[PDB]
């Protein structure tokens, strides 16, 4: 029934059947086959089994823009809520391309408030997903408001905790200018875009012919741009690094780099020794820097940052005895080892 | 033993008192002066005995069987607390099942169908509570109002509800005066509070209006939006008015807030509310208007008498089965464990006496 | 109503000059089932707290806790002073005599009143006066009440600075 | 060039008075290969941040993102002022239209373009101005072109107050 109240839990399904799917299965089909996958799917995956909580799961656009209001989907196609990574506390939202096409709303903006405030006030890092086609037109400026919420904060965060900003989908505009902001960007090959202004308009006034992957495209954020940290095979590649990112971190300022003690052997070790003769006798030439690093971290392990971008110098940052470092080092093999711009930022 | 005087005033000050019945007494005057005094006799129980302060007072935490008993009920409200207000309370802890037990579900039918019947909040309160522990403060004043302490996933909590059984369940000065307290002094010995809501109003009243409800039930509302605290809510159902601010809110600023579906939240119980949306149509006709009045009356209620009106704005978290609340609880606090909150620096702050 | 007005000119710094004569707490019935227990404590709860510089003179008979209520040195008030008219007690002396000496008064059922009207007064004469309190520092001095004027100002002169600190705590526990 | 300067204000305490003309971003590839994202987006990160007073008066244009760059309130300025000029909207009335009626565009192949000249001007009728914003109150004043300096100064005199409060933190992590 409906007055009744196990009726009133079961209508309680019946939306929580539809919130979950937002799209229509032919707004989901189109994206699955691109080679790509859902918000709900992102976070399943980013965050571990079971862990999850929703937020403003019913929350649906107070609109009356342009008929927009003739559709009030539920979770404003964003999906928001907090999981845990590992066992450390982690807060996440998803962007939902399906609807709207993953336009940005005043209670979509909102909902990433929830997020990030439940974040900063735990101390906790957010790692957030977008495949945002835009800032959605209709609202009106409520659009570039809600925007302006999210850099205020991006701001007032950045440095106490980590932002990560994983991009699988075209962000354009403002929406730029939020991952910008934060520590982090992964971003996928072909499958992800960022761009300040669209290509259609730099035709209209510079008269350049240009693709999406080169203006936008994964790679080119990665090399030449040089705001790109990192470029991923793949959408579970593209997860797996943030996994393995984060664990290098602490939750927040206040604490120290999660570490799991090990002892070190005092002894030099065989391939120690690999040293003395990494360097060349002439002085011309060049010896991967790479190696060097290799030799003196747990394991042998690094985890290259920004690979493509000024390969002048690498950095990373790798455990010690268990505890979590970073390295910048200079790079013979390219460009001699020097200096510049790309390389000092 | 009796106190009596200035002294009674020390206690006073004390977070809590503990008396032990018809062996304890206290008072400021004694009860040969009253008379001299003001022409009324009263006798010594009557007047400030164990049982005076527990419920007509408000003074007295509360009731001991004997003072066997009475210390060990001050032993085990101890444990709850923190030994300074540096540390955390102790939590011995203890992993949580989730899985969903039969107990859980118990919930899915707590709430009755019909919306006047009541419910004893007491079950709901313990389902969330570690081996349904829940240590009741104050029992005997104003009952309508459940203040508590428990403990999940071994961390010690403590706990503001609604309770329907008594007086219908609403607010009433009494009330505010109790469970008010009882958050400020959670909130400064870092206890997590867990609000559950079911609400309709704040006891009408000629007296309870007089006495100073507009003073006093602000001090709850103070005591919300002052704690630092994590503080998480559940509604049940009832939620009517200035109460829905009132107790435990996303207003005031708490971290997560739970609704079940039976749970209803609104400007106005809704046989007024439309009086004064539709004042202007059920007057006219006044033939075959009364009929239109109720049955109108079922197109609000029915429309506007849920959660999700809420939640849709996000005042509520999540709109959840009533089940599965005891889950809720144990991530939410896991989360919010480490929370930390800040303010313009002050002496102190005037809440309103 | 007091302990509001205290509370709140403590939170802004405005110094609080009080002037206390009472006699007792009023005796109710009702005034013990409200609560008058946890009530009248705010009062002395707040000029505890308080920091801003008080003082505090007593013109008239203070008489039991509540002469500790009212901005008594010993609640935490900086100077404190009253007129020879002031008398500081436990209790009236009326009372006061009758628990002292009250197997006395049983003793030689003949001339009760006179044998106890007569240490009435002993008490009262001897006691019921700024001076033995002074002796004890309670009270800064006895000052006359035509000097009254003369001592909050200068007082204030001193006091206008003063400062006071104790152990953090996110909010007080003070009885609602 | 703004960004450093809106820190380099910040630190010695000179409050920053902002005025608004934007028509956007600058297009061309050059400018997203050299990058634009990371570097223009610091302004965003100097004003959130900046703890001085914060006056901003619209005179011009303020389309898509540069809207909330330009010290707006949405960074947090305290705030906000608009001339009747002032157009605010998330594009072009002439981008703007061909996304939301795209269709509606389509179906005939003459009274077709004419149309879209109709429907650019219906969208700057409505939403090319200061008021929808109003509204919301993103900006606290609609004020005459002369007014603008009764309200800076005045708006001077008031914040000349203002201090307010973030999470501690050894540096920030602004995008170089």
Request: hydrophobic letters at 40%.
């Amino acid at each position: 029934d409906i007055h009744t109240t196990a009726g009133k839990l079961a209508d309680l399904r019946r939306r929580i059947e539809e919130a979950t799917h937002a799209g229509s299965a032919r707004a989901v089909e189109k994206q699955h086959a691109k080679g790509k996958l859902t918000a709900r799917e992102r976070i399943d995956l980013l965050l571990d089994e079971g862990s999850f909580v929703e937020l403003d799961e019913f929350a649906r656009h107070r609109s009356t823009n342009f008929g927009l209001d003739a559709n009030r989907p539920y979770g404003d196609g964003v999906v928001t809520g907090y999981g845990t990574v590992d066992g450390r506390p982690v807060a996440v939202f998803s962007q939902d391309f399906t609807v709207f096409g993953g336009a940005l709303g005043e209670v979509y903006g909102q909902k990433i408030v929830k997020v990030m405030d439940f974040a900063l006030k735990t101390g906790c890092p957010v790692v957030g997903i977008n495949d945002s086609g835009g800032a959605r037109i209709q609202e009106g400026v409520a659009s570039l408001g809600a925007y302006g919420e999210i850099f205020r904060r991006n701001t007032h965060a950045s440095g106490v905790i980590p932002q990560i900003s994983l991009v699988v989908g075209p962000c354009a505009g403002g929406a730029v200018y939020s991952p910008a902001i934060t520590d982090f960007t992964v971003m996928v090959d072909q499958t992800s875009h960022m761009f300040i202004t669209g290509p259609d308009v730099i035709k209209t006034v510079t008269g350049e012919d240009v693709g999406f992957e080169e203006l936008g495209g994964a790679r080119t954020h990665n090399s030449t741009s040089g705001v790109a940290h990192h470029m991923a095979g793949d959408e579970k590649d593209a997860v797996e690094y943030v996994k393995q990112l984060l664990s290098y971190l602490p939750s927040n300022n206040l604490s120290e780099p999660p570490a799991f003690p090990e002892e070190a052997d005092l002894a030099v070790t065989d391939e120690d020794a690999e040293l003395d003769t990494i360097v060349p006798d002439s002085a011309n030439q060049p010896y991967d820097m790479h190696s060097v690093i290799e030799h003196v971290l747990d394991d042998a392990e690094f985890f290259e940052t920004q690979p493509l971008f000024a390969p002048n110098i690498l950095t990373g940052f790798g455990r010690v005895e268990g505890r979590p470092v970073g390295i910048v080092a200079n790079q013979p093999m390219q460009f001699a080892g020097c200096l510049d711009i790309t390389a000092s930022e | 033993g009796p106190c009596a005087g200035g002294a009674v005033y020390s206690p006073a000050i004390t977070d809590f008192t503990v008396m032990v019945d018809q062996t304890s007494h206290m008072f400021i005057t004694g009860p040969d002066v009253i008379k001299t005094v003001t022409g009324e006799d009263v006798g010594f129980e009557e007047l400030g005995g164990a049982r005076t302060h527990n419920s007509t007072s408000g003074v007295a935490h509360h009731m001991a069987g004997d003072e066997k008993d009475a210390v060990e009920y001050v032993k085990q409200l101890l444990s709850y607390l923190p030994s300074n207000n540096l540390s955390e309370p102790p939590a011995f802890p203890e992993e949580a099942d989730l899985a969903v037990t039969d107990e859980d579900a118990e919930l899915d039918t707590i709430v009755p169908d019909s919306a006047n019947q009541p419910y004893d909040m007491h079950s709901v309160i313990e389902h969330v509570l570690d081996d349904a522990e829940f240590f009741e403060t104050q029992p005997l004043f104003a009952p309508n109002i459940l203040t508590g302490f428990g403990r999940v996933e071994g961390r010690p909590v403590g706990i503001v509800a609604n309770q329907p059984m008594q007086f219908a369940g609403c607010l009433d000065i009494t009330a505010s005066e109790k469970a008010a307290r009882f958050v400020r002094t959670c909130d400064a010995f870092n206890v997590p509070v867990l609000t559950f809501v079911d609400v309709p109003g704040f006891l009408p009243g000629v007296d309870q209006e007089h006495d100073g409800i507009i003073r006093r039930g602000a001090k709850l509302i103070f005591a919300y939006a002052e704690a630092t605290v994590p503080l998480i809510t559940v509604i049940t159902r009832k939620a009517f008015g200035g109460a829905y601010a009132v107790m435990g809110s996303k207003h005031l600023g708490a971290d997560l807030n739970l609704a079940w579906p039976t749970a209803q939240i609104a400007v106005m119980g809704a046989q007024g509310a439309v009086n004064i949306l539709h004042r202007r149509t059920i007057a006219d006709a006044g033939d075959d208007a009364e009929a239109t009045r109720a049955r109108l009356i079922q197109e609000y209620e029915d429309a506007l008498l849920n959660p999700y009106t809420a939640a849709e704005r996000g005042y509520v978290d999540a709109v959840i089965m009533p089940s599965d609340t005891r889950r809720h609880i144990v991530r939410g606090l896991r989360q919010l464990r480490t929370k930390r909150e800040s303010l313009p620096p002050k002496k102190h702050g005037n809440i309103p006496l």
